[PDB]
PDB file of C-alpha atoms and ligand atoms in Angstrom:
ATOM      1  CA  UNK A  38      99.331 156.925  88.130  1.00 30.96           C
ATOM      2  CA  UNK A  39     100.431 160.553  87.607  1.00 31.85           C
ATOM      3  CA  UNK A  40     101.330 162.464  90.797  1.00 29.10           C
ATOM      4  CA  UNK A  41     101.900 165.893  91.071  1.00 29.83           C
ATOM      5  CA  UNK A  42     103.848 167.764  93.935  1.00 29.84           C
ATOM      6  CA  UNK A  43     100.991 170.985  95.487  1.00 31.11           C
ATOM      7  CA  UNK A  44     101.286 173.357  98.070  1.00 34.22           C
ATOM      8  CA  UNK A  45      99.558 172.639 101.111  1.00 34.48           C
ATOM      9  CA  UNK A  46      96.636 174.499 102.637  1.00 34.51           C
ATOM     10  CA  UNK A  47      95.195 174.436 106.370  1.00 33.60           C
ATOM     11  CA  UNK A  48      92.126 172.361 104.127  1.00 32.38           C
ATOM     12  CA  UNK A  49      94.910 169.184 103.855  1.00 31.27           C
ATOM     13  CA  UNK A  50      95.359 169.060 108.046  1.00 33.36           C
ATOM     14  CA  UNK A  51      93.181 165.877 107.720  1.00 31.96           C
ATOM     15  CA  UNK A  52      94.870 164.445 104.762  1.00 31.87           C
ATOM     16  CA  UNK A  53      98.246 165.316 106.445  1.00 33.64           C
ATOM     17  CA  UNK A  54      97.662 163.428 109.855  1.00 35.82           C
ATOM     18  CA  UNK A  55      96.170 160.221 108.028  1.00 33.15           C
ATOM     19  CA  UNK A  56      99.442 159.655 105.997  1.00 33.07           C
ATOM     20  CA  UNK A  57     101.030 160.463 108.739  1.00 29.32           C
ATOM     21  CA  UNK A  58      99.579 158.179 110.910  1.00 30.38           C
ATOM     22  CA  UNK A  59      99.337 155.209 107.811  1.00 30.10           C
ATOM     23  CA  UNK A  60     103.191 155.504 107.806  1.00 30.04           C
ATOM     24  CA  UNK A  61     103.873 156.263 111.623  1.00 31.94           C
ATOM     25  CA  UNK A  62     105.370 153.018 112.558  1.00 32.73           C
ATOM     26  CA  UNK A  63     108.916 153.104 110.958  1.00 31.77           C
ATOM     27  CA  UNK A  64     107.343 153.859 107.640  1.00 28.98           C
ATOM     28  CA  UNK A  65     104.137 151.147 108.291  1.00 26.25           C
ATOM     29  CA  UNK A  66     100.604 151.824 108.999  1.00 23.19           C
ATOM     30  CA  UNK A  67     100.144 152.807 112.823  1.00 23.44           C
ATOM     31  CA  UNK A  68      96.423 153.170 113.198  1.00 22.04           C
ATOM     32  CA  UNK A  69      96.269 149.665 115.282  1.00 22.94           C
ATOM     33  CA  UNK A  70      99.101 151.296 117.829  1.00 21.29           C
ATOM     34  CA  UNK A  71      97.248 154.673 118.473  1.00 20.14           C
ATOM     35  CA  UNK A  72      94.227 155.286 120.208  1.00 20.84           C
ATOM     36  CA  UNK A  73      94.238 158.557 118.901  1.00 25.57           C
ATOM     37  CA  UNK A  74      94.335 158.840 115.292  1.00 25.65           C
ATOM     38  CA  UNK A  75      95.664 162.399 115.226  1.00 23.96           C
ATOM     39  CA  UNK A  76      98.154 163.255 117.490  1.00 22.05           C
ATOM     40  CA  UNK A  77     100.900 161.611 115.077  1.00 21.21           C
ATOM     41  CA  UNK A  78     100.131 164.165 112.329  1.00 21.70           C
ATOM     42  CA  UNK A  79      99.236 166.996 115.034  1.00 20.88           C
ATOM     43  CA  UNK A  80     102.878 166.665 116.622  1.00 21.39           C
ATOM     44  CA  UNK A  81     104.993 165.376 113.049  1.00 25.69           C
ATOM     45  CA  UNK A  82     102.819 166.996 109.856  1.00 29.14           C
ATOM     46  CA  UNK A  83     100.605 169.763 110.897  1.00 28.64           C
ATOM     47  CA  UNK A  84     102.962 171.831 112.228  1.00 27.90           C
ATOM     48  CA  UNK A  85     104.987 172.076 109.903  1.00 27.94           C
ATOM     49  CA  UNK A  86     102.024 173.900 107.363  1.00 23.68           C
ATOM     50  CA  UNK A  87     101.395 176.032 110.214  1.00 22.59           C
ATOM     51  CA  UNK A  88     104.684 177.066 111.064  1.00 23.01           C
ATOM     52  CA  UNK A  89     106.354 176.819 107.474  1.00 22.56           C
ATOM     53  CA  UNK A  90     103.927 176.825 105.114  1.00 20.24           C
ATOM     54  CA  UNK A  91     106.326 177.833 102.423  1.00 18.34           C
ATOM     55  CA  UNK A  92     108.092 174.440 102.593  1.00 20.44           C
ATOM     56  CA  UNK A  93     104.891 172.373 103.262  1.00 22.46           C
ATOM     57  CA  UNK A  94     103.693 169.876 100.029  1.00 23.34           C
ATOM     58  CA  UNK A  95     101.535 167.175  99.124  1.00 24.38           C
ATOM     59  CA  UNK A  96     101.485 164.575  96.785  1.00 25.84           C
ATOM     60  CA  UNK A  97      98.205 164.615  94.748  1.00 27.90           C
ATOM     61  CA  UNK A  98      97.262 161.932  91.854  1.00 22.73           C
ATOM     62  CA  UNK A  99      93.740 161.368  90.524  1.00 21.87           C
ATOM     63  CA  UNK A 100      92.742 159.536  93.815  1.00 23.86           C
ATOM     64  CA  UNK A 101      93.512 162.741  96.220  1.00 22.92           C
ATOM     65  CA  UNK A 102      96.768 163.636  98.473  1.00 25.58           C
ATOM     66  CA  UNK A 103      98.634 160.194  98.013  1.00 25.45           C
ATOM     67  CA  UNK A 104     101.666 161.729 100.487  1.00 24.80           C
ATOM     68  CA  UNK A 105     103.409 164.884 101.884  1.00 25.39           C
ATOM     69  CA  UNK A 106     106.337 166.449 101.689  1.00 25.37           C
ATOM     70  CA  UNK A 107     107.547 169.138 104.595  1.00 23.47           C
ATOM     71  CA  UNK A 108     110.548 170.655 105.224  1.00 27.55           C
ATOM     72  CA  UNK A 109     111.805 173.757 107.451  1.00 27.68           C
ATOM     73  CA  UNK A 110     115.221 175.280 106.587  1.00 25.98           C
ATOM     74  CA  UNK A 111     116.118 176.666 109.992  1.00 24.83           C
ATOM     75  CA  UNK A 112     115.814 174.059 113.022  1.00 25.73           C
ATOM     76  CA  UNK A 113     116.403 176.985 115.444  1.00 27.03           C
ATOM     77  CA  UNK A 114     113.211 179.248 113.626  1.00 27.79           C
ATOM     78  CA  UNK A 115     110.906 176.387 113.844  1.00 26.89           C
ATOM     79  CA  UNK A 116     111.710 175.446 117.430  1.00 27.19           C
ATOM     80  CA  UNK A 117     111.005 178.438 118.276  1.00 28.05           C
ATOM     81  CA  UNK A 118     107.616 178.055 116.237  1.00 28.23           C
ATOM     82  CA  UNK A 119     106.979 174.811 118.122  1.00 29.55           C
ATOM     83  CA  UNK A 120     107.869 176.216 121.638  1.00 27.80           C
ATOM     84  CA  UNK A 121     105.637 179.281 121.728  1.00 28.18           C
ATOM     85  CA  UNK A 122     102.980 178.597 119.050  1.00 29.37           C
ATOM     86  CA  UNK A 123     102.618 175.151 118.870  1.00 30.30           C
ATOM     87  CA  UNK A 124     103.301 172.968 121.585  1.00 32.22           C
ATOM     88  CA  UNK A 125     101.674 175.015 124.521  1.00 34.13           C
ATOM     89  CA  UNK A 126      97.897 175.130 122.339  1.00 35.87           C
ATOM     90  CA  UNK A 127      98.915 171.360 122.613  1.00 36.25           C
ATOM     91  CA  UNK A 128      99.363 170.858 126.029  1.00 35.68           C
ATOM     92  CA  UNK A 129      96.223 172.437 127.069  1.00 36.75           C
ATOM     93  CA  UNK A 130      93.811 169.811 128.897  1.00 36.24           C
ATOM     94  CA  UNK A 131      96.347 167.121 127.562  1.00 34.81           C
ATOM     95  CA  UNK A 132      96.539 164.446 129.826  1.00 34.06           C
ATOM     96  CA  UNK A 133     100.110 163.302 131.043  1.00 35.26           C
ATOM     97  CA  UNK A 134     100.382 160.051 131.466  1.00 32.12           C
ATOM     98  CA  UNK A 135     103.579 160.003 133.493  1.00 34.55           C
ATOM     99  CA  UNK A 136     107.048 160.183 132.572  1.00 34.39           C
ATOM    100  CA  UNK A 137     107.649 156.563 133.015  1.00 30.55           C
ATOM    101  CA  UNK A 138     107.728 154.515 130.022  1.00 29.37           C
ATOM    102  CA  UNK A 139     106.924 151.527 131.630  1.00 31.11           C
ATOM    103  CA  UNK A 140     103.085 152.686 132.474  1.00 32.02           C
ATOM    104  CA  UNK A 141     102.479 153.583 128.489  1.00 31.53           C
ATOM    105  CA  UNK A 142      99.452 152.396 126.573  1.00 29.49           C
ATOM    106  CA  UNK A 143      98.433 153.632 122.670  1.00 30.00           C
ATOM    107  CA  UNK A 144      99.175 157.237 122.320  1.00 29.17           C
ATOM    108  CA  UNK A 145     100.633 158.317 125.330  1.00 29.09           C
ATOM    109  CA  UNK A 146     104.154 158.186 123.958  1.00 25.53           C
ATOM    110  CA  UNK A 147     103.072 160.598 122.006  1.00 24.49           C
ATOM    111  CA  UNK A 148     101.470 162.963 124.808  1.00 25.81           C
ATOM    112  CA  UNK A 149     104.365 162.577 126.953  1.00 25.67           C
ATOM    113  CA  UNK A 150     106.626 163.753 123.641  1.00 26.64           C
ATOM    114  CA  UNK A 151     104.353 166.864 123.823  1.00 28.31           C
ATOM    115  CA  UNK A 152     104.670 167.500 127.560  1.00 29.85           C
ATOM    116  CA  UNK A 153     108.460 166.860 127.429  1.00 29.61           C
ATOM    117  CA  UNK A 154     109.922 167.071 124.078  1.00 31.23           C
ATOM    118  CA  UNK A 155     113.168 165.062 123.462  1.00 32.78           C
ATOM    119  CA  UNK A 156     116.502 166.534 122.706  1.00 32.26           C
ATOM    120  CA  UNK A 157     117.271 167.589 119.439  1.00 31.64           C
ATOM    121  CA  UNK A 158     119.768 165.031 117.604  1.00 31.48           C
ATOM    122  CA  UNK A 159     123.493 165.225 118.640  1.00 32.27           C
ATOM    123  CA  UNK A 160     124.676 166.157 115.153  1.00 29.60           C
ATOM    124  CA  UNK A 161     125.974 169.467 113.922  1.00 27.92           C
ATOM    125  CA  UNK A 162     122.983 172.553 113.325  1.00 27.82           C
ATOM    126  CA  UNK A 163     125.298 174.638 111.475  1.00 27.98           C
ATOM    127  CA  UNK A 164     126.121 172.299 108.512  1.00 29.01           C
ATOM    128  CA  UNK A 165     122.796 170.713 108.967  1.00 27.26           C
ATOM    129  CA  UNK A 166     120.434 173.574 109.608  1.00 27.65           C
ATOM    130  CA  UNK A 167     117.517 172.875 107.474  1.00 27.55           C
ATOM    131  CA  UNK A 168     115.526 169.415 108.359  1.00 24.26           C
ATOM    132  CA  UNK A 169     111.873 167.978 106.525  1.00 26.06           C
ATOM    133  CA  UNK A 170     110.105 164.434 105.986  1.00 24.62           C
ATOM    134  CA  UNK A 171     108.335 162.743 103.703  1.00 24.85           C
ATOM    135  CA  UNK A 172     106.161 160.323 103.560  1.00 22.94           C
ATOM    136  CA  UNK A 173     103.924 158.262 100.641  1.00 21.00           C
ATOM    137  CA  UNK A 174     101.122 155.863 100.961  1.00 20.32           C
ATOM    138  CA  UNK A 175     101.852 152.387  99.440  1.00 21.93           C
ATOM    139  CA  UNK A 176      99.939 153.492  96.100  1.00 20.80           C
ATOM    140  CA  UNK A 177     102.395 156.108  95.450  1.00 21.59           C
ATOM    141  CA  UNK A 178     105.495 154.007  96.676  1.00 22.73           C
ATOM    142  CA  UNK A 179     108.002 152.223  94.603  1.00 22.25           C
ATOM    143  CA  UNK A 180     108.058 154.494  91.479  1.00 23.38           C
ATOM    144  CA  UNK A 181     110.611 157.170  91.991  1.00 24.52           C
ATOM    145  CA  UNK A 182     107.317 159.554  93.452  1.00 21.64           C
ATOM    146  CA  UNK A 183     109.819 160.193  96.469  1.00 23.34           C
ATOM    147  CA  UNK A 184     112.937 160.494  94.109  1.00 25.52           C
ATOM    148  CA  UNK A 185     111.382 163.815  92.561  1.00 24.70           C
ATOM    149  CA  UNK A 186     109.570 164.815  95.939  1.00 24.98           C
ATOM    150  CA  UNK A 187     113.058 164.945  97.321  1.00 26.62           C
ATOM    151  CA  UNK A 188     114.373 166.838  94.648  1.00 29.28           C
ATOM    152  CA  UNK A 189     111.873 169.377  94.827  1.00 32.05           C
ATOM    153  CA  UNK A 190     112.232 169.980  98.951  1.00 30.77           C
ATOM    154  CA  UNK A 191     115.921 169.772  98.745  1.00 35.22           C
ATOM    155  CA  UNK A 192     115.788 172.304  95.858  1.00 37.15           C
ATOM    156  CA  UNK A 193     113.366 174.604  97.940  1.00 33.97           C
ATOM    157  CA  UNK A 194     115.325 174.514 101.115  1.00 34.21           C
ATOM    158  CA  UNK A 195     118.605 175.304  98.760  1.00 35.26           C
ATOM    159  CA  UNK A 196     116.755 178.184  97.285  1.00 37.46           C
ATOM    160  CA  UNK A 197     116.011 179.429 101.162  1.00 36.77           C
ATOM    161  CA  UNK A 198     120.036 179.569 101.341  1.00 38.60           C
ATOM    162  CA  UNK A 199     120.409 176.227 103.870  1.00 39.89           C
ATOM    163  CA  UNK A 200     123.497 174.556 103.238  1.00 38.90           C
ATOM    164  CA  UNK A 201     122.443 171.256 104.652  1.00 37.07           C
ATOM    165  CA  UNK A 202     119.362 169.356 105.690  1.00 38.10           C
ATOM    166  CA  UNK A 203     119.182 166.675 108.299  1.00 39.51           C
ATOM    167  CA  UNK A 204     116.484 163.685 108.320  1.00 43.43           C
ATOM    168  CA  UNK A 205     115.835 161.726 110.993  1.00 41.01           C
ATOM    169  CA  UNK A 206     114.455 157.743 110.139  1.00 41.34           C
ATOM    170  CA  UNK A 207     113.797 154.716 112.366  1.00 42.52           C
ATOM    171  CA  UNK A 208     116.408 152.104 112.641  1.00 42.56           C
ATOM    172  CA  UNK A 209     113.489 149.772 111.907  1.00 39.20           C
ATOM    173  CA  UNK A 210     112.810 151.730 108.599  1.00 39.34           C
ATOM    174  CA  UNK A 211     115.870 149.821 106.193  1.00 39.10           C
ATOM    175  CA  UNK A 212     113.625 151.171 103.544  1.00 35.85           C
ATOM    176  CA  UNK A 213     114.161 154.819 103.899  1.00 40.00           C
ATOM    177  CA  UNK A 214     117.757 154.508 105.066  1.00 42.44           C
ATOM    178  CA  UNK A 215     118.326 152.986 102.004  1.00 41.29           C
ATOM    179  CA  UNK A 216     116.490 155.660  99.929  1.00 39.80           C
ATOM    180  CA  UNK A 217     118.673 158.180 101.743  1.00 41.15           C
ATOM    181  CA  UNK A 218     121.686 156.011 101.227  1.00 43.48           C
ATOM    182  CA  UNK A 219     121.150 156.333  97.452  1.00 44.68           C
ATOM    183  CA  UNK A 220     120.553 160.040  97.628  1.00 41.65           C
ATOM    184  CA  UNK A 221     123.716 160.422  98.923  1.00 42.03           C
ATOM    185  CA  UNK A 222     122.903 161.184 102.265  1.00 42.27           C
ATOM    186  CA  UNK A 223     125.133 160.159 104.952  1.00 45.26           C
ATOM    187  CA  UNK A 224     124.484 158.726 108.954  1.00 43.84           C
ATOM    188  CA  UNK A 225     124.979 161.878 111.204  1.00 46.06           C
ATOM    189  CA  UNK A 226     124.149 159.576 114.103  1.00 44.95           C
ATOM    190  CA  UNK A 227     122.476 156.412 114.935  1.00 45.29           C
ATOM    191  CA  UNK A 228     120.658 155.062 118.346  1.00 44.30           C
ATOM    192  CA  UNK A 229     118.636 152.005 118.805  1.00 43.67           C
ATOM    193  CA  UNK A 230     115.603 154.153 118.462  1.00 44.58           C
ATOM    194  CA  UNK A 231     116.421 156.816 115.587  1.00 45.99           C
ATOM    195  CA  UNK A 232     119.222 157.462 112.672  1.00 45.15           C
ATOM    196  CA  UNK A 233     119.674 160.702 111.262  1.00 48.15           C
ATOM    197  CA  UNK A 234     120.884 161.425 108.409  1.00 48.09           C
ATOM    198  CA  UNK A 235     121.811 164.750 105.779  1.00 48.14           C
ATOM    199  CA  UNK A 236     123.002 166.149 102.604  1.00 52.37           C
ATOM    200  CA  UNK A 237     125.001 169.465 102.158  1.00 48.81           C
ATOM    201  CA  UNK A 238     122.705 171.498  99.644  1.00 45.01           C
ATOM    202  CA  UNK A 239     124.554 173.942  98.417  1.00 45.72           C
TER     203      UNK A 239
HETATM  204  C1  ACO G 302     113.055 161.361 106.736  1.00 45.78           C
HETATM  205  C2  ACO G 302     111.713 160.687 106.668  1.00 45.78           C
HETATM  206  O1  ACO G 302     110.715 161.255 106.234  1.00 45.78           O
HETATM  207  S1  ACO G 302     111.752 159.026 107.171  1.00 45.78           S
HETATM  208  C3  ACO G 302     110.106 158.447 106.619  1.00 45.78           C
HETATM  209  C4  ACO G 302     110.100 158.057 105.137  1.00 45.78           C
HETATM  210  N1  ACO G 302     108.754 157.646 104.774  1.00 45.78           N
HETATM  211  C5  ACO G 302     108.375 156.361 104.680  1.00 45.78           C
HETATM  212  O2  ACO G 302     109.123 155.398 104.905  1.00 45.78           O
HETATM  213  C6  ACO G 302     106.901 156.188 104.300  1.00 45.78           C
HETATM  214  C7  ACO G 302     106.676 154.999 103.375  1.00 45.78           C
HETATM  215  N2  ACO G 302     107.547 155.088 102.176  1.00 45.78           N
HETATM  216  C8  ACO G 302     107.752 156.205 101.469  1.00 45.78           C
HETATM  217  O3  ACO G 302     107.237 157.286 101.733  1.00 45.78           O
HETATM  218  C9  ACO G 302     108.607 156.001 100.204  1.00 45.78           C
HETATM  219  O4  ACO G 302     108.694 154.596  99.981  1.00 45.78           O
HETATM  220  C10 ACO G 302     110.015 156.627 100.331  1.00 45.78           C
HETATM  221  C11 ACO G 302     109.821 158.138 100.449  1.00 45.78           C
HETATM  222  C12 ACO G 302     110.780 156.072 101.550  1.00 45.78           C
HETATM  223  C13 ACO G 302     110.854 156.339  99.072  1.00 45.78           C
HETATM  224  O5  ACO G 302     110.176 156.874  97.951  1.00 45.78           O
HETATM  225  P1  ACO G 302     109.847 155.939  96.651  1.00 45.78           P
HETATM  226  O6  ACO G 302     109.146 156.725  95.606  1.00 45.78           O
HETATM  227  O7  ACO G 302     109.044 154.737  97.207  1.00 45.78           O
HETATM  228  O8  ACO G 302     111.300 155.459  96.217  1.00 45.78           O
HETATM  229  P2  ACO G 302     111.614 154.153  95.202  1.00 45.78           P
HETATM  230  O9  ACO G 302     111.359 152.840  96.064  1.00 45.78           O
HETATM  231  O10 ACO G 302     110.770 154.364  93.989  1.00 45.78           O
HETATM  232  O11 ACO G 302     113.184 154.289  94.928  1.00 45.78           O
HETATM  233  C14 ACO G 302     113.694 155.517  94.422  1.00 45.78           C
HETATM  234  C15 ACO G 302     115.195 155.317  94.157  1.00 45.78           C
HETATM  235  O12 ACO G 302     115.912 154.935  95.378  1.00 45.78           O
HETATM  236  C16 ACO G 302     116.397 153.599  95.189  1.00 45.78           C
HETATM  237  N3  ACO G 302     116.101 152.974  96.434  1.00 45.78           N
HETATM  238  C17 ACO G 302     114.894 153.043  96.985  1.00 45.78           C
HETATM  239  N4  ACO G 302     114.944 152.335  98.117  1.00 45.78           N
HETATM  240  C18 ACO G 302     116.181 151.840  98.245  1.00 45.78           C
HETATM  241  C19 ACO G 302     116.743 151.086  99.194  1.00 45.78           C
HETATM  242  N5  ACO G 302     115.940 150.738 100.198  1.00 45.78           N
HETATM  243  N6  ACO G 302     118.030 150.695  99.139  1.00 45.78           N
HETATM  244  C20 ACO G 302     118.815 151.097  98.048  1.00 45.78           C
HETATM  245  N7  ACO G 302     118.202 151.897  97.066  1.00 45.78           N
HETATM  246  C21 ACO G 302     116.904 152.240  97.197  1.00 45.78           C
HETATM  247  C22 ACO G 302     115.465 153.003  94.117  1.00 45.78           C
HETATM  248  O13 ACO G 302     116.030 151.851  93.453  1.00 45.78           O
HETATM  249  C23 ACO G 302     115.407 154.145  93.177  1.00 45.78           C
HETATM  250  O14 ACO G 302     116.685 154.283  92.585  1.00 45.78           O
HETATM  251  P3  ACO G 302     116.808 155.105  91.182  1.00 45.78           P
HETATM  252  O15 ACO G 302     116.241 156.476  91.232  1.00 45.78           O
HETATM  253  O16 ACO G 302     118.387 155.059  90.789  1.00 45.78           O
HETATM  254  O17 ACO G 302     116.054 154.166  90.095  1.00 45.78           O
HETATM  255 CL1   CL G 303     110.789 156.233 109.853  1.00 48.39          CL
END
């Protein structure tokens, strides 16, 4: 049952984008949603190894990587990252499948998110500068795993100088928001389709 907390390598991509993906749906396996098993991880984990790999984790017990843990502690550094270095590699041969939501099937949510990337989250940068996730599979949920995970990214991104991280969690995740709740994070802002939430760090 022992889990330790790692620094990631380019050799856990594949590890990254299947817990992503087996926690993509609000926190619940996505695989039967997707048609393609990687984009989740290639738009939500990967990147942030490539483009931070000082704040970039996993979770590792006897069985393997068990979860991750990523964080970034400038959200104006790694758009930047994401804009030039990530998302155009992306968006080569990708195919669009409209803008229109309405025409979706599987994945293409997900290439459309690439194409056109949402706003950012109408909270405040400055307080909230530094942002990560985290995410377990069910073996390593349940046990305070995420409890010292936290502590550890929250620590790192404190030791980077960020006086605040922001998280953003599906309203259909009551798990998480809860987790967060008990942190002592608070709601920066809520829509039917995403909360976000943060801590001062310092
Ligand atoms: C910002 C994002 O990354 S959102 C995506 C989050 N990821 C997921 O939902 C993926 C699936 N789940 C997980 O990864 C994990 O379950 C996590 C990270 C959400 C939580 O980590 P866990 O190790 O499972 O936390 P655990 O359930 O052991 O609870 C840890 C503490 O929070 C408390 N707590 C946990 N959940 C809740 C809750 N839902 N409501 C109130 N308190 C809670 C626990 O009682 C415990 O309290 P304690 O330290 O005083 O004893
Ligand atoms: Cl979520």
């Amino acid at each position: 049952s022992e889990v330790v907390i790692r620094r990631a390598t380019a050799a856990d991509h594949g590890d990254l984008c299947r817990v992503c993906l087996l926690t993509g749906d609000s926190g619940r396996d996505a695989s039967s949603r997707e048609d393609d098993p990687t984009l989740l991880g290639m738009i939500y984990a990967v990147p942030y190894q490539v483009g931070a790999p000082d704040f970039a984790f996993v979770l590792e017990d006897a069985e393997g990587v068990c979860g991750y843990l990523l964080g970034a502690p400038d959200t104006l550094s790694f758009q930047h990252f994401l804009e030039k270095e990530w998302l155009p590699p992306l968006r080569a041969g990708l195919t669009d499948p409209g803008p229109d939501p309405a025409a979706w099937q599987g994945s293409d949510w997900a290439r459309d998110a690439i194409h056109r990337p949402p706003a950012l989250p109408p909270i405040d940068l400055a307080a909230y500068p530094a942002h990560g996730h985290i995410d377990l599979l069910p073996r390593a949920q349940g046990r305070g795993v995420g409890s010292r995970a936290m502590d550890h990214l929250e620590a790192a991104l404190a030791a980077a100088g960020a006086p605040g991280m922001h998280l953003q969690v599906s309203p259909e995740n009551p798990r998480a928001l809860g987790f967060y709740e008990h942190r002592g994070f608070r709601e920066l802002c809520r829509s039917e389709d995403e909360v976000v939430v943060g801590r001062r760090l310092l």
